[PDB]
Write an enzyme that holds these catalytic residues in place. Sequence first.
Site, short mmCIF file in Angstrom:
data_model
loop_
_atom_site.label_atom_id
_atom_site.label_comp_id
_atom_site.label_asym_id
_atom_site.label_seq_id
_atom_site.Cartn_x
_atom_site.Cartn_y
_atom_site.Cartn_z
N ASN A 179 -9.29 5.10 2.31
CA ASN A 179 -9.73 5.85 2.02
C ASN A 179 -10.90 6.56 2.34
O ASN A 179 -11.67 6.54 3.47
CB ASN A 179 -10.54 4.98 0.51
CG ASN A 179 -11.48 4.19 0.69
OD1 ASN A 179 -13.08 4.56 0.80
ND2 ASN A 179 -11.74 2.44 1.06
N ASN A 209 -8.49 8.12 -6.48
CA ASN A 209 -8.94 7.14 -6.21
C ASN A 209 -9.60 7.46 -8.34
O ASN A 209 -9.94 8.49 -7.89
CB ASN A 209 -9.74 6.19 -5.59
CG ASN A 209 -9.07 5.51 -4.44
OD1 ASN A 209 -8.43 4.61 -4.89
ND2 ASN A 209 -9.48 5.82 -3.20
N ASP A 238 -15.80 -5.04 9.05
CA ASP A 238 -16.96 -4.70 8.13
C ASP A 238 -17.57 -5.58 7.55
O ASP A 238 -18.45 -5.13 6.80
CB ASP A 238 -16.63 -3.28 6.84
CG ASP A 238 -17.55 -2.39 6.79
OD1 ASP A 238 -18.84 -2.32 7.65
OD2 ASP A 238 -18.06 -2.45 5.22
N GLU A 276 0.52 -1.24 0.20
CA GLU A 276 -0.02 -0.20 -0.06
C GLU A 276 0.98 1.62 -0.37
O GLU A 276 0.62 2.12 -0.66
CB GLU A 276 -0.98 0.14 0.99
CG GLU A 276 -1.65 -1.01 1.62
CD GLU A 276 -3.13 -1.04 -0.05
OE1 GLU A 276 -3.63 0.05 -0.41
OE2 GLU A 276 -4.17 -1.75 -0.22
N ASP A 316 -6.86 7.70 -0.96
CA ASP A 316 -6.11 6.85 -0.08
C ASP A 316 -5.09 7.27 0.50
O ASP A 316 -4.20 8.12 -0.05
CB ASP A 316 -5.70 5.36 -0.63
CG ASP A 316 -6.60 4.02 -1.80
OD1 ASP A 316 -7.86 4.58 -1.74
OD2 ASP A 316 -6.29 4.12 -2.27
N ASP A 364 -12.66 7.03 -8.64
CA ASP A 364 -14.14 7.57 -7.86
C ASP A 364 -13.76 9.34 -6.97
O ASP A 364 -14.92 10.01 -7.25
CB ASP A 364 -14.63 6.39 -7.27
CG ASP A 364 -14.12 6.95 -6.05
OD1 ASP A 364 -13.23 7.43 -5.31
OD2 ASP A 364 -15.23 6.04 -4.62
N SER A 367 -12.35 10.21 -4.81
CA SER A 367 -12.24 9.36 -3.59
C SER A 367 -9.77 9.63 -3.23
O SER A 367 -10.01 9.12 -4.77
CB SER A 367 -12.78 8.56 -2.88
OG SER A 367 -12.09 7.22 -2.79
#
Length: 129
Positions: free
Chosen positions: A59, A46, A101, A35, A52, A48, A50
């Site tokens: 994110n 990202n 989650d 990462e 990270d 979209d 967003s």
Amino acid sequence: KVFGRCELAAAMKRHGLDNYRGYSLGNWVCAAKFESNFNTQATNRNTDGSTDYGILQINSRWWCNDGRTPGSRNLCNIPCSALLSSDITASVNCAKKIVSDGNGMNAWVAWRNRCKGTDVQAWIRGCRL
Ligand SMILES: [Rh+]
Ligand SMILES: [Rh+]
Ligand SMILES: [Rh+]
Ligand SMILES: [Rh+]
């Protein structure tokens, strides 16, 4: 801050990630390596809109507020900048929520593609823990 491999393993273990939801410490170190290369300051956009953040590339779509991700959530109740600290407490405590989650560490696409099914123990080989 750029952590050493064993230094990050030790901080992660102290902060309760060793076997957290059954994920051995080497899984968390492997995820951090791919990462962020162990760099708390790492940011990546990202597709979209967003972003990270930090050592585990958490994110803004779901987990933090960066002031520029429309229609997003802040489920860790933190500014995304907290994830960039030399202190990994915010990243670790947010990672514990993420991994709980429903999808476990599959939440980290890099973990699924580069760590899952590999000899992740190699990431903590030779560390004093
Ligand atoms: Rh362990
Ligand atoms: Rh352990
Ligand atoms: Rh700490
Ligand atoms: Rh030990």
